[PDB]
């Protein structure tokens, strides 16, 4: 059950890397925030679910 | 201030107060003196405290007298924690032996005229033979500085140049006592003690003393001066 924790954590790192690249360029693009709301919220929701998943799966690891 | 409540105060209650240089004073007890139980005694926690320092000063008109001096150092002169043994006889004949403990204190005083007089206020290796009212004797006085000390131009007994090397032509001249020979020979001091305010219940005594010792000689240099010291002393028995 450790392998699922490393997969969840590395997925969290990839999500955070994409967020560091994407959230500023989505914010500062012309009229890009108005059309990328859904993808940014999707990234943040997956990020939060993976943080909670890693935290919970550490209690079983 | 007795020895009982001295132990009752912590470090921080005497820290910086000056109490730590004060010998205990037996408030209770009697002054009859003769009621001391004679016997083979090993006194422990001997305490010593000066109350005046005087220096013999030579005057042009020939008057030789002890002058009042200003203590240049702060409260670093009293002596505590000395040990030894003493005997008391039937008639009152007492001999005093002092062997180990903090029995010395480097002290510096100012003659009127601004002359620094360093002297090692010492009582080490004291043999006080006499009676209970008064008992006197000699005590060993180390010079001041040890041989490994070196003066501002190197030199000194154990470690140094043995020569004023700052000028390469004054190698052998009338400064013999300054560079050729360094003398640290330990001298002998004269002290007088007195006992008052004895306590036979807890085996503790008090009294005043009277010491006379020379100063530092600057390692075989300008003459020393005799230092008359007066104060109070405290001790306990066995």
């Amino acid at each position: 059950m450790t392998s699922i924790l490393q997969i969840a954590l590395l997925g969290l790192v990839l999500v955070s890397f994409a967020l560091v690249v994407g959230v500023p360029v989505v914010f500062a693009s012309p009229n890009g925030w108005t059309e990328n709301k859904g993808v940014v919220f999707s990234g943040l929701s997956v990020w939060f679910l993976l943080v909670f998943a890693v935290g919970v799966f550490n209690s079983f690891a | 201030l007795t020895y009982d409540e001295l132990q009752g105060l912590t470090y921080l209650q005497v820290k910086g107060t000056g109490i730590a240089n004060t010998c205990p004073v037996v408030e209770q007890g009697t002054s009859n003196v003769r009621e001391l139980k004679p016997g083979d005694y090993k006194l422990e926690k001997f305490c010593m405290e000066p109350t005046s320092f005087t220096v013999k000063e030579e005057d042009a008109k020939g008057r030789e007298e002890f002058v009042k001096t200003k203590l240049l150092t702060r409260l670093t002169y009293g002596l505590d924690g000395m040990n030894g043994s003493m005997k008391i006889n039937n008639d009152g004949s007492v001999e005093f032996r002092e062997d180990e403990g903090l029995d010395y204190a480097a002290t510096t005083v100012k003659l009127p005229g601004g002359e620094y007089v360093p002297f090692l206020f010492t009582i080490k290796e004291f043999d006080g033979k006499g009676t209970l009212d008064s008992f006197s004797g000699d005590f060993l006085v180390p010079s001041y500085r040890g041989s490994t000390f070196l003066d501002p131009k190197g030199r000194g007994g154990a470690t140094g140049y043995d020569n004023a090397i700052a000028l390469p032509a004054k190698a052998d001249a009338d400064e013999i006592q300054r560079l050729n020979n360094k003398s640290y020979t330990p001298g002998k001091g004269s002290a007088v003690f007195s006992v008052a305010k004895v306590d036979t219940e807890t085996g503790e005594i008090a009294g005043v003393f009277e010491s006379i010792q020379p100063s530092d000689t600057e390692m075989g240099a300008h003459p020393a001066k005799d230092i008359k010291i007066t104060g109070l002393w405290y001790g306990q028995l066995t």
Binding site: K37, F41, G55, V56, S59 | -
Partner: protein, 243 residues
């Protein structure tokens, strides 16, 4: 006052302005009901008929779950500090009177009286009482009166009343005649109800997970914050230290 923060076009939404432009709300939630945050990711509202029909069930769930939250947190705490309750914990209170073991009722401050009536009588009067009340609720028909707000009212008052908000007989203390304060209190009621619904569902899942009551949960958590939480309880037993 300040009813322009819960109704109208300018009202507190379920997301602030940066993450939710005001044009992103469903058109059928434009500030007409108490507790309208424009919260609808899944289209269950459709239009105003279905919204107020679902609000009926929301309000009944709220008015049940609030009393429920009080009824789960209070007697367990009373027993924990020392009342003679014997069954304050909610997921095992029903197990007390399985063998005739009737519960002890606390009429605080003058209580700890034994309830001398068994489970069969409890359930028979519980159905015949609340079934009568719920048949009254759908019909708006009530036999007798003597409410403190209006005394000894006859049955010709529940007709004409507003459904889900029947003032008068159900309003002994009034304090709702001003439509302004009535709207403010409607927002207060629905928000307290949603909070208590979240609280009681949290009570349920906390009980299923930790095997104990929520007052025990909050008490042990306040005693040891890091030593007693979700990540502590799912550990099972200790943790191999990393030294």
């Amino acid at each position: 006052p300040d009813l322009e923060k819960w109704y109208g076009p300018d009202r507190k939404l379920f997301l602030p302005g940066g993450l939710l432009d005001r044009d992103d709300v469903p058109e059928y939630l434009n500030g007409e009901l108490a507790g309208d945050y424009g919260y609808d990711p899944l289209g269950l509202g459709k239009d105003e008929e279905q919204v107020e029909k679902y609000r009926a069930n929301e309000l009944l769930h709220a008015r049940w779950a609030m009393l429920a939250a009080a009824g789960i947190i209070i007697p367990e705490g009373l027993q924990a500090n020392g009342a003679d309750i014997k069954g304050g914990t909610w997921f095992e209170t029903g197990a007390e009177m399985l063998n005739g073991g009737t519960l002890n009722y606390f009429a605080v401050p003058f209580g700890v009286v034994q309830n001398p009536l068994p489970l069969a009588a409890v359930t028979l009067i519980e159905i015949v009482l609340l079934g009568a009340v719920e048949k009254f609720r759908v019909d708006g028909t009530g036999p007798a009166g003597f409410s403190p707000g209006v005394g000894k009212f006859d049955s010709d008052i529940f007709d004409g009343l507003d459904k889900l908000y029947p003032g008068g007989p159900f309003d002994p203390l009034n304090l709702a005649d001003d439509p302004e304060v009535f709207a403010e209190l409607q927002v207060k009621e629905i928000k307290n109800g949603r909070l208590a619904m979240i609280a009681v569902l949290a009570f349920a899942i906390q009980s299923y997970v930790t095997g104990e009551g929520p007052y025990a949960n909050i008490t042990k958590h306040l005693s040891d914050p890091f030593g007693y939480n979700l990540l502590t309880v799912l550990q099972g037993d200790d943790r191999v230290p990393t030294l």
